[PDB]
Design a protein around this ligand. Structure first.
Ligand code: CLA
Ligand code: CLA
Ligand code: CLA
Ligand code: CLA
Ligand code: CLA
Ligand code: CLA
Ligand code: CLA
Ligand code: CLA
Ligand code: CLA
Ligand SMILES: CC1=C(C/C=C(\C)CCC[C@H](C)CCC[C@H](C)CCCC(C)C)C(=O)c2ccccc2C1=O
Ligand code: SF4
Ligand code: SF4
Lengths: 157, 95, 33, 80, 742, 141, 153
């Protein structure tokens, strides 16, 4: 049931039932980290939305004043602050890695071996688009979950 | 020939021998609705410029942080309240 | 507003200036002329 | 990368080369010893710095001599 | 078939090899060129796989060495029984086993050390022991120093017997490899005969000796006017008056009417209220049932006849859902590697020692053990340390198997190859879960410290704060508190009282195991324990898997199991060997077991151990401060280390002055170890060469040239002194505290 | 001597391990070793595990030179076969590496020159004050 | 009375320390029968304590405000017995040892493999050499004057 990676038994990995299952290869390929054909901005928006929609949870329900009246009103600001930290993080990552105009450093071909087009996420402008998408989608998700925490009634976490 | 029986050193196809495969990179087309995509492409383009995003995040995060700390009343955080108690004397009178 | 000045500067030196310095020095660390 | 300089006190025992796990060293012909050979060091750029060459050099102090220097990915023993 | 397979006189008994030192190898049987020769002599002293490269001579050597170890253990037992005979207050302890400190050591009055002979009680001035041997002897129904004296002579007889047996099985008539390599017979005998008949004969002792004498002592009887055990055997009216089930005889047994034997083989769960131990009827039934179990288990493997199993036949035919095609070749490596077997056996023996500690604190099997808090603390602490050490030895010997006794050409296994192949996934996920565990346990402690220091106790991780309750362990306690009513109706009370209920078996003014509660602090410290265990497993399994090759040194198996490094290259390879990994796993086993015994001592001193009043309210030693102080490291520093280490500093004067002294000296040796771990051989060799100049200038130059310790030997001396000093500090602390408070 | 001109020869039978070419092959140089095994047999490969090298020519691609030369010494000492490995940069230009003259480096083949060789005892090196404020060190005169 | 210290036979704190230790021993003596063996050992310790304090009284020990015998190691004759008369008795014995183990090392210095006598000590040779260091100071003195004490490299 376990198989060497792509048949090649001298690359540092293995085709297991965890990393090579069709359910996983469908899930881990159709999520915005690996949408190599679409432009990096839309998938970055998806990533930011998914990461800001939930980051408000820990800050609002475990924060320093979660037991007060400004529980969500301050936890959501804290999550927006972490989003403004992490967009800065991605920004400096893209600045240090890809300078201004180089071609993509991504894996060129796929597992089978067909000449797939290089992922534009790993370019300077591409990762910059990803940073902008992450920032916008993260503030979007933080504010949307702030909207939902007081609008929609849940028994909470 | 990389696809031969136990040959993994095709020298002209050095991406298959080095392990340059995209383990999960799908070249499948845009899944989102094109109008939603256009909305995000127009509304997030201002954040695309990196040199103008780093400066913006620095001078916006620092501004919001030095602002929300300043106008934070004595109900959010207690350091801005004060003692709110009679100050007790130290040892040996006060010294 | 002089008891409010610690609230201005302690974040600006402790959170903001460290972010500035860490970002700038990380760029200086990875630069290539 | 590193700097594996050898000295003329070498006796041509060929143990520094038989210990070298990166082929930094190689015996050449020479006329300064009973064995008529000495251990050169062309592939210093492949030197990891393990000093097995000088943990096998049977001289009073040493003939082969590893001076650690600028560390590259070949000299930092990196398979990644 | 399984023959005897021995040979006569393989090695000549003589003192010629006593004379020439280091005879057992090639590079040591020449003489000392340096002083490293001595260290390499003692280091390779029992490295029999290095002396002779055949399993026959190795196996003879380890067999006779096990005989020497058994002679030593019998000699030590003879010593303990004898010191309990002539240098003890065992009679006075039997008369009053609640206010008389168990003492079986007296010091000589020479330099003022006579004050170590304390007022333990019973007209006896001596050292209060903590081995619980008095409790064993009351569980055996001894009641006389003559019996301890004669079993001491018997243990000396057995020590001489084992020494003669080692001499005979090395020098006069030694087995050959066909005798050791057969393991179906070894398992069959060690199951049916050693552990089966051993438990059977102990159950016979208990049924015939321990139960009557302990029932007499519990009823209240001076141990002098108590009938001897042979009177219980011979005089049937006596033992029949104790248990009328004996009046019928073994026709209850042979007609399978065992229901009438339920007067002395009860399943009476829980502890004996009169004495705080377990019910010796329950223990006799236990050893009997265990005897039946191991006796039917020791007839499983095929030895010489047609019936049975082949361990090869089992392992080579064990297909399954997850890599069952493997398991082939394990009979080869385990019957051709003493290091594989030593690793496996040390792992399971140390884990059993830990199980032993955990089951002796909670189900105290000996009478008046739970109320001798020094005995309980010392036993748990001891067996915890022994288990951790034995597991770390399992690591060392797994590594020594991986380096030396591993040949994929001849002795190939599918499972071990599959483990070595994805070993980086193993160590990566284990490193990750170690980081995760370190954070979400110790960082919880740091959060608690910060919040309590910032004046935010509402934000701590506690029961009066953010609660991290052990729901699963609490649920297990709820079940086992209710288990004997529905799931195990044969038990009148639960297996232990740590679960719950209105059960508090006090024997005097002492508790003996009320139900241990599990709060937020217990969650925190149990995750600290899982953490320290996982980091120890990380270090040790990492040394095991990377003993042979890595991305750094792909020829490590050619460098050996126990080598310092491969030089400063590759950045540095300082502690790359598997020996260095067990050397670090020793420090982490120390951290693990030290926090384990700290959890134990504080939890018992706060929630269990204490006094019981005439109104019925328990006053603990520390006072229940584990749920509020053991959430912060400042509380461990304050309410545990600073608070409980008051009796070890006030120890000076009273008998416990030695524990005071052994505190500081232990504190020293630990620090003395830091001279070795931090430093390196080069500085000390250069200092030594300056001192050698100073000696050459006085014609006092030695011929054994002074060399600084080997790098590996510096690390060994360091970890040795470190473990000694830390463990002796904790031993002094524990014993002084618990002998001065309970 | 002319190099041996690495062909597309087969590889050993190996079930795969976590010791292969991660990123030092994608963007930097990786290595490849070729050995002629007279018979098919099992051998402990340096990336952890145990592979079965085939009869005739075999080829194994490794991540660094120490893996190649460790495996080569184990082959030459245990199986007594003649190994020779290369270095292949990610653009090509396979570099012949190990023998460099056809004969192993322990043999004093003529032609190879003296490089990294001081014609002095080791303690006749000048002090660092002599070479201070100069790009040279005390072991390059 | 040097260094502001009263003698110990006159110091009230010294006698108070004696009485305190004696009462501490007697409070442990009450728990045992007066004819029993622990009681007799405690009484022997009591007489040992009493004569210890008496002997520190009579031997000129000086006691401080804490009431403990202090040692005056400066050179005053009254207190030579505290440091110098033992100290010489050390430097003799110590210099015995080093003069023996050195001499032994010179006697096994001229062997073929002299290291197998470091780990396997020639008991006859060592017993011949041991008493050479009885009157070691004159041997060391003369060897210093003859130059045989310091190797000439
Ligand atoms: C608090 C930590 C946290 C959490 C909760 C999430 C949660 C998520 N991330 Mg984010 N992410 C994080 C940290 C986190 N991330 C960090 C630190 C990085 C930097 C590397 C990223 C980078 C990242 C990218 C680039 C993307 C996500 C995406 C996602 C989403 C789906 C993929 C996923 O989680 O499963 C996959 C999880 C793994 C592959 C981790 C390995 C787990 C092993 C297999 C566990 C063992 C399982 C075993 C069978 C049992 C999900 C909402 C995707 C998204 O936005 O989808 C909408 C996406 O494209 N994440
Ligand atoms: C510290 C852990 C933590 C905490 C306290 C919360 C707390 C909360 N979450 Mg979040 N969440 C978390 C981790 C956490 N979450 C993680 C790791 C994931 C996976 C990425 C999610 C995914 C998630 C979703 C998808 C949603 C929440 C929602 C919520 C809210 C109601 C449930 C509550 C504020 C709900 C909400 O609307 O929030 C307001 C909601 O829809 N959570
Ligand atoms: C590591 C242990 C630990 C833990 C658990 C906590 C927990 C907490 N701390 Mg404490 N703290 C710690 C260590 C820790 N601390 C240490 C070490 C220090 C000092 C060095 C402090 C100092 C400190 C201060 C000074 C304060 C806190 C506060 C807090 C609270 C709010 C944290 C916050 O902003 O939420 C943000 C949390 C997140 C962003 C976490 C997201 C993680 C998600 C849930 C992981 C999900 C993974 C998912 C399962 C992956 C698989 C699925 C995927 C594939 C989809 C929270 C109760 C605050 C407080 O008092 O509130 C009570 C506060 O003011 N902490
Ligand atoms: C090396 C000298 C030194 C040191 C160690 C500190 C240390 C500190 N200052 Mg002070 N400060 C200094 C020089 C120094 N100051 C000088 C020279 C000035 C005049 C420009 C000030 C004016 C000043 C103000 C107005 C404030 C501090 C504050 C602080 C605290 C937080 C850091 C911020 O400050 C910002 C640092 C500067 C303005 C210095 C720039 C040079 C910290 C205790 C804050 C405070 O009181 O916290 C309680 C605050 O609000 N500093
Ligand atoms: C007096 C009887 C006698 C005599 C003359 C010999 C003579 C010999 N034996 Mg045998 N042997 C004997 C008894 C004897 N043995 C017994 C009783 C046992 C069972 C343990 C053995 C088991 C045995 C084995 C397994 C081996 C020998 C070997 C040898 C030879 C080497 C001896 C040597 O250098 O070690 C001298 C060593 C010592 C004197 C050390 C004594 C260690 C004892 C047993 C333990 C003491 C531990 C102590 C309590 C703890 C330390 C405390 C301390 C810190 C204060 C030599 C021919 C070896 C041989 O020929 O193989 C090449 C060998 O491998 N012997
Ligand atoms: C683990 C084994 C062990 C240990 C550690 C001790 C330890 C001790 N014994 Mg015990 N003993 C033992 C076994 C042991 N014994 C056995 C097997 C016997 C039977 C022969 C004895 C018989 C015995 C007697 C008869 C006496 C001791 C005494 C002593 C003490 C001083 C011994 C001494 O300085 O000897 C001197 C040193 C050498 C011989 C060397 C010391 C506490 C003495 C004691 O407790 O005095 C109050 C004492 O009188 N022991
Ligand atoms: C049913 C018979 C039987 C019994 C009782 C034992 C018992 C034991 N064996 Mg095993 N063994 C057996 C059969 C048996 N063996 C067979 C058939 C083989 C060949 C396959 C082996 C091969 C074997 C090896 C290779 C080793 C042992 C070891 C041990 C001892 C382990 C230490 C221990 O648990 O201490 C508990 C201690 C005791 C119970 C005290 C023992 C006292 C009695 C007198 C000896 C036990 C009976 C014994 C078999 C001798 C019979 C009489 C003799 C005159 C022939 C233990 C005493 C190990 C050991 O310690 O080495 C010495 C060891 O290395 N045995
Ligand atoms: C069943 C138990 C068992 C057995 C049979 C062995 C057997 C062996 N071990 Mg293993 N080992 C064990 C348990 C065991 N070990 C445990 C529990 C640990 C963890 C600490 C180790 C860790 C370990 C390492 C790390 C190494 C071995 C090695 C060895 C071999 C040679 C040992 C030697 O010659 O030293 C002879 C004996 C000594 C040198 C004496 C040791 C002195 C100890 C450490 C001091 C402690 C004594 C005391 C408690 C302190 C107070 C003393 C007092 C006087 C002040 C031998 C095969 C070595 C090996 O095979 O390498 C090739 C090796 O490197 N072992
Ligand atoms: C107190 C001393 C100390 C500490 C903190 C550590 C910490 C660590 N050791 Mg080390 N180690 C130590 C002593 C220590 N060690 C000693 C004395 C030895 C002697 C042999 C070793 C030997 C050793 C080995 C051999 C191994 C470790 C491992 C580890 C790690 C496991 C836990 C982890 O990562 O969880 C999370 C981190 C911690 C629990 C550390 C404390 C941090 C706390 C929780 C709060 C953090 C606050 C937060 C980050 C804010 C920071 C401030 C901000 C301004 C940036 C961690 C880095 C293992 C490892 O690296 O692999 C996993 C490993 O294999 N250690
Ligand atoms: C202190 C120290 C030393 C020096 C330690 C010495 C050399 C070992 C101690 C040897 C003892 C003192 C030798 C004397 C014992 C003899 C048996 C002589 C007995 C005769 C009388 C002294 C009784 C190292 O060599 C070293 C090496 C690597 C890492 C750390 C260290 C390290 O910390
Ligand atoms: S090891 Fe030393 S002596 Fe021997 S060949 Fe090499 S340089 Fe010469
Ligand atoms: S410091 Fe010591 S252990 Fe580290 S590389 Fe150098 S010699 Fe080896």
């Amino acid at each position: 049931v376990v198989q060497p990676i792509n048949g090649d038994p001298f690359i540092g990995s293995l085709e297991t039932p965890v990393t090579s299952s069709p359910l996983i290869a469908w899930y881990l390929s159709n999520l915005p980290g690996y949408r190599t054909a679409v432009n990096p901005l839309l998938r970055g928006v998806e990533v930011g939305l998914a990461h800001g929609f939930f980051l408000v949870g820990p800050f609002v329900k475990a924060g320093p004043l979660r037991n007060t009246a400004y529980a969500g009103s301050a936890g959501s600001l804290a999550a927006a602050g972490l989003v403004v930290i992490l967009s800065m993080c991605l920004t400096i990552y893209g600045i240090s890695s890809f300078k201004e105009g180089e071609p993509s450093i991504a894996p060129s071909l796929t597992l089978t071996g067909r000449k797939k087009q290089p992922d534009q996420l790993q370019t300077a402008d591409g990762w910059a688009k990803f940073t902008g998408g992450f920032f916008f989608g993260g503030i979007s998700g933080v504010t949307w979950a702030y909207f939902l925490l007081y609008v929609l009634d849940l028994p909470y976490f | 020939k990389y696809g031969d029986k136990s040959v993994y050193f095709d020298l002209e196809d050095l991406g298959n021998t080095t392990g340059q495969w995209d383990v999960y990179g799908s070249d499948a087309p845009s899944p989102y609705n094109p109008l939603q995509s256009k909305f995000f492409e127009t509304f997030a383009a201002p954040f695309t410029k990196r040199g103008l995003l780093l400066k913006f995040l620095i001078l916006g995060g620092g501004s919001l942080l030095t602002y929300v700390s300043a106008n934070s009343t004595g109900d959010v955080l207690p350091i801005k309240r004060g003692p709110q108690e009679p100050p007790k004397l130290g040892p040996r009178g006060k010294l | 507003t002089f008891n409010n000045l610690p609230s201005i500067f302690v974040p600006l030196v402790g959170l903001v200036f460290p972010a500035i310095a860490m970002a700038s020095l990380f760029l200086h660390i990875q630069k290539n002329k | 990368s590193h700097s594996v300089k050898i000295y003329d006190t070498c006796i041509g025992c060929t143990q520094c080369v038989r210990a070298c796990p990166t082929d930094v060293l190689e015996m050449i012909p020479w006329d300064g010893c009973k064995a008529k050979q000495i251990a050169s060091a062309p592939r210093t750029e492949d030197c990891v710095g393990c000093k097995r060459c000088e943990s096998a050099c049977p001289t009073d102090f040493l003939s082969v001599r590893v001076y650690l220097w600028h560390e590259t990915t070949r000299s930092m023993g990196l398979a990644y | 078939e399984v023959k005897i397979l021995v040979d006569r006189d393989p090695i000549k008994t003589s003192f010629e090899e006593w004379a020439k030192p280091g005879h057992f190898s090639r590079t040591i049987a020449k003489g000392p060129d340096t002083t490293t020769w001595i260290w390499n002599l003692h280091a390779d002293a029992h490295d029999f796989d290095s002396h002779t490269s055949d399993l026959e001579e190795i196996s003879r050597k380890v067999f006779s060495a096990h005989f020497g170890q058994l002679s030593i253990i019998f000699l030590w037992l003879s010593g303990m029984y004898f010191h309990g005979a002539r240098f003890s207050n065992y009679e006075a302890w039997l008369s009053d086993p609640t206010h008389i400190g168990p003492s079986a050591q007296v010091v000589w009055p020479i330099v003022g050390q006579e004050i170590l002979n304390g007022d333990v009680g019973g007209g006896f001035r001596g050292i209060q022991i903590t081995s619980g041997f008095f409790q064993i002897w009351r569980a055996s129904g001894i009641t006389s120093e003559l019996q301890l004296y004669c079993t001491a002579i018997g243990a000396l007889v057995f020590a001489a017997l084992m020494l003669f047996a080692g001499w005979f099985h090395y020098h006069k008539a030694a087995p050959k490899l066909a005798w050791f390599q057969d393991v179906e017979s070894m398992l069959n005998h060690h199951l049916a005969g050693l552990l089966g008949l051993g438990s059977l004969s102990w159950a016979g002792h208990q049924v015939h000796v321990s139960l009557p004498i302990n029932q007499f002592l519990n009823a209240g009887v001076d141990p002098k006017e108590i009938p001897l055990p042979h009177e219980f055997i011979l005089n049937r009216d006596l033992l029949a008056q104790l248990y009328p089930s004996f009046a019928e005889g073994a026709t209850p047994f042979f007609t399978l009417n065992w229901s009438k034997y339920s007067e002395f083989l009860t399943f009476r769960g829980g502890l004996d209220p009169v004495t705080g131990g377990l019910w010796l009827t329950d223990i006799a039934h236990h050893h009997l049932a265990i005897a039946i179990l191991f006796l039917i288990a020791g007839h499983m493997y095929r030895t010489n006849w047609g019936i049975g199993h082949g361990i090869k036949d089992i392992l080579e035919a064990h297909k399954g859902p997850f890599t069952g095609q493997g398991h082939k070749g394990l009979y080869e490596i385990l019957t051709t590697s003493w290091h594989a077997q030593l690793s496996l056996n040390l792992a399971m023996l140390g884990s059993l020692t830990i199980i032993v500690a955990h089951h002796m604190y909670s189900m105290p099997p000996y009478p008046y053990l739970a109320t001798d808090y020094a005995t309980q603390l010392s036993l748990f602490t001891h067996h915890m340390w022994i288990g951790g050490f034995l597991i770390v030895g399992a690591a060392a010997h797994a590594a020594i198997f991986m380096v030396r006794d591993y040949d994929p050409t001849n002795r190939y296994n599918d499972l071990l190859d599959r483990v070595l192949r994805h070993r980086d996934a193993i160590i990566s996920h284990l490193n990750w879960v170690c980081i995760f565990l370190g954070f979400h346990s110790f960082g919880l402690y740091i959060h608690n410290d910060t919040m309590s220091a910032l004046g935010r106790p509402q934000d701590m991780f506690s029961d009066t704060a953010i609660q991290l309750q052990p729901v699963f362990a609490q649920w297990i306690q709820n079940t086992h508190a209710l288990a004997p009513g529905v799931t195990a109706p044969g038990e009148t009370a639960s297996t232990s009282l740590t679960w719950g209920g209105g059960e508090l078996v006090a024997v005097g003014g002492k508790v003996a195991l009320l139900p241990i509660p599990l709060g937020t602090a217990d969650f925190l410290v149990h995750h600290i324990h899982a953490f320290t265990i996982h980091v120890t497993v990380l270090i040790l399994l990492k040394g095991v898997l990377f003993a042979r090759s890595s991305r750094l040194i792909p020829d490590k198996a050619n460098l050996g199991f126990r080598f310092p490094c491969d030089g400063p290259g590759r950045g540095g390879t300082c502690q790359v060997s598997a020996w260095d990994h067990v050397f670090l796993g020793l420090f982490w086993m120390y951290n693990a077991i030290s926090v384990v015994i700290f959890h134990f001592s504080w939890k018992m001193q706060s929630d269990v151990w204490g006094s019981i009043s005439d109104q019925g309210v328990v006053t603990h030693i520390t006072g229940g401060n584990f749920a509020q102080s053991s959430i912060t490291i400042n509380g461990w520093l304050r309410d545990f280390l600073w608070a409980q280490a008051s009796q070890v500093i006030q120890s000076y004067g009273s008998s416990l002055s030695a524990y005071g002294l052994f505190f500081l000296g232990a504190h020293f040796v630990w620090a003395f170890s830091l001279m070795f771990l931090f430093s390196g051989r080069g500085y000390w060799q250069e200092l030594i060469e300056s001192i050698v100049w100073a000696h050459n200038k006085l014609k006092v130059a030695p011929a054994t040239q002074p060399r600084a310790l080997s790098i590996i030997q510096g690390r060994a001396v360091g970890v040795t002194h470190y473990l000694l000093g830390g463990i002796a500090t904790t031993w002094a602390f524990f014993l002084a505290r618990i002998i001065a408070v309970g | 001597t002319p190099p041996q001109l690495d062909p597309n020869t087969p590889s050993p039978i190996f079930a795969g391990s976590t010791g292969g070419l991660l990123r030092k092959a994608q963007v930097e140089e990786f290595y490849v070793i070729t050995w002629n095994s007279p018979k098919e047999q099992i051998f402990e490969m340096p990336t952890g595990g145990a592979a079965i090298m085939r009869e005739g020519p075999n080829l194994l691609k490794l991540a660094r030179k120490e893996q190649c030369l460790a495996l080569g010494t184990r082959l030459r000492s245990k199986y007594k076969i003649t190994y020779q490995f290369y270095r292949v940069f990610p653009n090509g230009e396979v570099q012949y590496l190990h023998p460099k003259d056809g004969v192993y480096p322990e043999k004093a083949n003529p032609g190879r020159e003296g490089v990294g060789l001081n014609m002095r005892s080791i303690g006749k090196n000048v002090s660092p004050i002599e070479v201070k404020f100069t790009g040279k060190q005390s072991y390059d005169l | 009375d040097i260094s502001g210290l009263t003698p110990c036979k006159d110091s009230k704190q010294f006698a108070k320390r004696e009485k305190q230790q004696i009462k501490k021993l007697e409070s442990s003596l009450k728990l045992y029968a007066p004819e029993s063996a622990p009681a007799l050992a405690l009484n022997a310790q009591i007489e040992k304590t009493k004569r210890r304090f008496d002997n520190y009284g009579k031997y000129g020990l000086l006691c401080g405000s804490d009431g403990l015998p202090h040692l005056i190691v400066n050179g005053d004759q009254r207190h030579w017995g505290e440091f110098i008369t033992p100290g010489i008795l050390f430097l003799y014995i110590a210099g015995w040892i080093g003069w023996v183990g050195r001499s032994y090392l010179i006697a096994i210095s001229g062997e073929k493999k002299p290291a197998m006598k470091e780990i396997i000590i020639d008991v006859p040779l060592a017993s011949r050499i041991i008493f050479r260091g009885f009157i070691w100071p004159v041997a060391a003195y003369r060897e210093f004057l003859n130059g045989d004490l310091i190797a000439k490299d």
